Symmetry: D3
Subunit: 244 residues, 6 copies
């Protein structure tokens, strides 16, 4: 039985949960839920793996989004239909600033919309902006956990390869739009690349839902293209505590 098309969940499964932690990788869901009380597997369908847990006596959902705006848009919509009102994305990321180190934690205030799904919720003029309370929770959680943290703009790309101006590819080329784009974002102070935040932030900020975004830095793109975690995950859990 399911009250939604993709996730395989009923409202009753959520046990009153109003906050979801949303990693990209289904395999990371169990790990994150294990940091909390009474973790229980709910469902696994396609790229959507969902567990329920408890935090200071209140139910919390952990559900994977898969890679990219499109699958993220499905998980967020269906979770919203089941009663989730606050979404915290926890990701991995490639830093594009020389002064950001592997293992650092980045909190996103807003995202460069290098995606398509965000346009399905708001025109390009609309900012892919995080909720102020969620952002505050993540920043304060980062202090509590103890991590080297940066706060600012992230570039959110519909591709891992040409949209992040990667050249370690089959074609070894990048379309005109993205030729020289990395150095452009770098000059504009953009911190990092990832793949889900523009859709998440736009769809939430334009629909009365709260969203925030934190990621662990797994490569620095000024040094290396292909990578080569816990601070970031402890932070998203600690932030959830503050948003309940």
């Amino acid at each position: 039985k399911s009250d939604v098309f993709h996730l395989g969940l009923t409202k009753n499964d959520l046990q009153g949960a109003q906050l979801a932690i949303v990693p990209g990788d289904p395999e990371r869901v169990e790990k994150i839920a294990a940091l909390m009380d009474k973790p229980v597997k709910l469902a696994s369908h396609r790229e959507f793996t969902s567990w329920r847990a408890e935090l200071d006596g209140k139910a919390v959902i952990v559900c994977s989004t898969g890679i990219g705006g499109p699958s993220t848009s499905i998980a967020v919509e269906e979770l919203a239909q089941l009663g989730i009102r606050t979404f915290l994305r926890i990701g991995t990321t490639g830093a594009i600033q020389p002064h950001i180190n592997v293992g650092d934690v980045l909190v996103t205030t807003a995202s460069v919309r290098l995606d398509g799904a965000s346009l399905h919720f708001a025109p390009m003029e609309f900012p892919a902006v995080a909720d102020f309370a969620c952002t505050t929770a993540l920043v304060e959680a980062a202090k509590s956990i103890g991590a080297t943290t940066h706060v600012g703009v992230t570039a959110s790309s519909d591709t891992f390869y040409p949209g992040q101006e990667r050249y370690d590819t089959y074609s070894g080329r990048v379309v005109r739009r993205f030729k020289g784009s990395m150095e452009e974002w770098q000059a504009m102070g953009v911190m990092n690349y990832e793949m889900e935040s523009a859709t998440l932030l736009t769809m939430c900020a334009s629909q009365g839902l709260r969203a925030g975004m934190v990621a662990g830095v797994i490569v620095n793109r000024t040094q290396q293209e292909i990578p080569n975690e816990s601070h970031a995950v402890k932070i998203v859990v600690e932030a959830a505590r503050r948003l309940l």
Copy 2:
């Protein structure tokens, strides 16, 4: 060992394979592989589950893409790095034409680019067009299997909900761009909506790779009666038979 960042595969894993069948759902991969000879699981990481099998003596890969152009773009790029040159997508779809029945099979000649990843490969002016040999193989395979087939344009959307003009949602609203859009595509002859083809077709057609798209119709957005889980499974099985039969003609 992996030659690539996401798929967990090496060139050795492919055993000379140059064609891949690419469903969206990782759960479909084993079922598709079971239509061929000596299938073996290769890897499963994130939404990317891959098997290898033989078709008429030759190695073939089956690898899931996940939902959307972004994860599709990863799978296609990484399979291309490993040596794949021909990609056949097999999907599920919602028909938007009144005359297309649940059970029908759709072969996509080109797609309306309502996605974002395609733009990362070619500007919007560029057609998200299928390879002629792949499309031919799918059409011919449909005739071999015995199916009611429709050939034409598909709308490929970055969303399941507002991009396909669904109002049955949390917010119940659809942004200006997509308001009244389903009626527009209907009048323009578009057969259906899905979520991966604009990215697949554009990225292949602009990089010297061959791609084709086939789907079974599991629902019609104009009809009143919504079929159950079973009826939809029979339709999937049919389109799946067609994609394997098509693959035989492209080796």
Copy 3:
């Protein structure tokens, strides 16, 4: 006396025809019609010269479009009003791929929309895609006569000069949008430039009409001419008529 504004034709003139072969140049119309049965002149108004003929007992029209999407859009609309449902464009062309040779035949599956008129029928996201049956008929006709055939994407430009990144012009300037564009299309596997197909294919694909396109390669810029063209003409003409046979 006429059922349409420009073509100077009535439904009666078409004698039940449902297929039109559509070259750009009025001079080619008679030549194409001459490969078919019972050819006869119909009308000539501006760049629209029309002839009718017969293949396997069915009426066929041959009608020129002029240069560009604007005049093509007029001919296709008015032919559709008169009852045409399948359109086969036949052109001669220059190639942008180093391995497409003069004498080769190109069958277009879809076009890069570097025109304006296509946007009057569908938004840019919609593909300027040929009909499958038409494309199939063209490729099959090309094989039956042993042509060296290339099947793929064509770039369809509203200009002969800057849109095709030509600098041998009065100004010697190409606008930012088109600076470096030929190299980009080349890298993307685009076969050639022409000027009508984006409008033809988009307007047909978005209005329930069937369209296809074939062209003979008469020059190749990236490889650096009278008898070759006439020979190449005759061959792509042979193909479009043989394709038309299969589509009736």
Copy 4:
């Protein structure tokens, strides 16, 4: 022998001509050239028919463009190559303003760019504007024969049907972009639709060439020789 790819002309053939009158229809060329001295045919290829004549001792070209911006862009480019520096468009037109009557004369100051070829010369932000000298010459030539004249903006469409919001067609449909567009142009004071001026005006204004356009009103969808005299009279002021 030809200096250009399409027109079939050499610089020599122009005999020092620097101004061209550019109608759409080849069948209008000789009629226009006949109003001037020593009219002689030069060439005829596809929709490009060219004649030379003389106006107060100076050679002048009359050359047809065919229908639409693409065809027009070829003719203007190749005439420019041959030495033409001033282009005067002569047309017949409908109108979309009820106060504009059949027999009135329209002088276009600039065009709404509903075409595609203009974008091959300048981005959309750039105005499809007529040369001030040409517009002046046309307006004052119109006044001098007592013509009723409207001066203002014309909408320049790559189509005759949906871009001019016509529904009396095969599909009976008009794409979202153009749905409600005629009422919008009407409200913004646009006089009329035609099909060539956005291309002509943009390619000339962005390339140092002078261009102008006059048209005679022959129909008006909102309602239930003169212009030819004007273009020729205007031409003699611009030599």
Copy 5:
């Protein structure tokens, strides 16, 4: 007070139908003082307004401030009060090597590098000046013997990156504007300024008449009274 920003009433205008609109509020009184019976009306924000008389007819002088946004407020509110003709007077640089300090530029139409023009008409619409206004300005410049250039102006929402200036805090110019000055130069664009695309589009699309004249103060490559004298003399011809 009727209108929200200008603090003016219809009665304040005493039947005026024309306004001279400089950018700088401090230049308003200077322009008014050249005509008869100059009287201050109001001063709010960047909008300083004076009334004067020219050949026994009331005229307005009202500043716009810098940019399309504030210009759009002044023109709207003045039109609400009965103004139907707007003459912009500016000071300007130039991007063409042959255009000297002391030269006067008359703008036929503007490259729309602004945002506000889009709130009145889509980009396809030309930011074109009224023919009568442009004629009056050109004739008034002949009248006083000024060296006049007539043509296209690039109208930018910024003084710095939109005019491809690199002598700035960041030293960065966004992709869109990198190499843009050279492009405008090759296209024959005379100068940059910051209000004309909004002024011309908003007027040409609402039945209002607008023109623009500017004196050249500097040249990127290498008489404010003279331009002011022209704008006042042109105004006499437009009453």
Copy 6:
């Protein structure tokens, strides 16, 4: 002294080491804002740019007007940056588009809908017109300290007062296609208000390593009327400035 910048008529000396500016739209508001701080001194007045210096907790602060709109804002911000300013706090007036927002309420902008043109001269449309986290935090925390009725969220920032804010009580009575129905759309999307400077300010600062915040007082509620019939935000911007020195 010869001005260090083209429009503002200021020298670096004039700033006395100031690194923060409070930036109202109206030049006539500058003196009023500077009067709430220590040692206020008029610096200059040119075009729409009136500038004062003052002191907060012994630190020099600039108050400078921007005029209406992105273009004039882009001049003031660029030239102040050149002079040494690294933090900008806009204080404005606004029309609320949500029904329960009262005239006099204080709105703090997290990011803006870019309905302007000048922002495109700094970053392509995909880039967010987002406020600095530290500045926004200071404004929110200052508003709480004085117990103001405050709303935090997205603002629509328009290049026009009339059609871009979907006002119909105008000379033409017309609104171009792009903006027809637009207010309802922003309302449904949770946008709080309209104003005219923040998209440019926020984009040009976030893309150039400058910190910016945005606060405005509501002067009309657009669900009720287009034009009103006829200082919490100000206390807040000064208190927030104190926290950012």
